[PDB]
């Protein structure tokens, strides 16, 4: 059965720290403890080891990513921008 | 002597219980025994050809 | 303690050796003026400075 109406993962924090703070940390905790699909082996076994460090249990590949997400929007846009600068340099 | 009476059910009652029902007989241990007993039965039925893979697997999830 | 160094053991040995009463014949010497050993030490009364 459904156990909580809205708190979900931050039900561990009880009544403490304030509703807005629990709501803010809920999304980060979900993304931080979620298992992503490894882009090297295709398995959903890439999970966070430490802050910024993402390890795949299957292919044993370690990636430097974001603090809570596997990769950050700034990193993705920057990688695309660097790829465009390199293709302009070659062209 | 009192152990022999208790195996027959004496001195158990309601006024002889101090621990919680889960403290006297944990639900997890009851569930753990239940899963092992029923999974053993389903396995033995599969290699005795009483059920196939598909009946076993659906019943395993049940 | 049971664990002790050689220097500590030797210091304790000297203290133990020198903590004993005077010989009886000392009181018979000429111009003795010594009645007992005033430097006696008991382990429970006075502790060694060490």
């Amino acid at each position: 059965a459904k156990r909580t109406k809205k708190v979900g993962i931050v039900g561990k924090y009880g009544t403490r720290y304030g509703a807005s703070l629990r709501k803010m940390v809920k999304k980060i905790e979900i993304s931080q403890h979620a298992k992503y699909t490894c882009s090297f082996c295709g398995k959903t076994k890439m999970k966070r080891r430490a802050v910024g460090i993402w390890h795949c249990g299957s292919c044993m590949k370690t990636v430097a990513g974001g603090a809570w997400t596997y990769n950050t929007t700034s990193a993705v846009t920057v990688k695309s921008a660097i790829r465009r600068l390199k293709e302009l340099k070659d062209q | 002597k009192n152990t022999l009476a208790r195996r027959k059910g004496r001195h158990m009652g309601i006024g002889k219980r101090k621990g919680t029902a889960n403290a006297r007989m944990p639900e997890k241990v009851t569930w753990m025994r239940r899963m092992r007993i029923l999974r053993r039965l389903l396995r033995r039925y599969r290699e005795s050809k009483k059920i196939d893979r598909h009946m076993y697997h659906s019943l395993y999830l049940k | 303690s049971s664990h002790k160094t050689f220097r500590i053991k030797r210091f304790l040995a000297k203290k133990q050796k020198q903590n004993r009463p005077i010989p009886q014949w000392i009181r018979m010497k000429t111009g003795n003026k010594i009645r007992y050993n005033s430097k006696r030490r008991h382990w429970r009364r006075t502790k060694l400075g060490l």
Partner: protein, 149 residues
């Protein structure tokens, strides 16, 4: 410990004797184990490559930027941060860059820097929520945390 940015062990070949040299680069975001990184003037523009700011294009961004030519990285080292290459002038061999503080700075064109943003993402997004978590954070850093007014 005490640092929000991951560190990368990178193993090079010694060019003058038979040996392996292990470095401790600050991890640019997106690099992975088993990946080849390249350092030098002729390095190509890839995330994790190290090459002088003078050879980089006019809009690239960099990770572990040298404050002076010759030393190791000094600028934009904290997690999630980056510097931007604004402009060059080959005469006087100078390069203007923008620092994470938003301030512009003129440096030598020979200063090396890692291409990309440093890993460790938005570490400051998450509320600490607990005096205990603040305690554990600063215990790995230094004795500064319980702050009496």
């Amino acid at each position: 410990p005490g640092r929000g940015a991951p560190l990368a062990k990178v193993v090079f070949r010694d060019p003058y004797r038979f040996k392996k040299r292990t470095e401790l680069f600050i991890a640019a975001e997106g690099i992975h184990t088993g990946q080849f990184v390249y350092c030098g003037k002729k390095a190509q523009l890839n995330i994790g490559n190290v090459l002088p700011v003078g050879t980089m294009p006019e809009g690239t961004i960099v990770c572990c930027l040298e404050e002076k030519p010759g030393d190791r990285g000094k600028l934009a080292r904290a997690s999630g941060n980056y510097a931007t290459v604004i402009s060059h002038n080959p005469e006087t061999k100078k390069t203007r860059v923008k620092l994470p503080s938003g301030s512009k700075k003129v440096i030598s064109s020979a200063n090396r820097a890692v291409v990309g943003v440093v890993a460790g993402g938005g570490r400051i997004d998450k509320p600490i929520l607990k005096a205990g978590r603040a305690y554990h954070k600063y215990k790995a850093k230094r004795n500064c945390w319980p702050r009496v007014r």
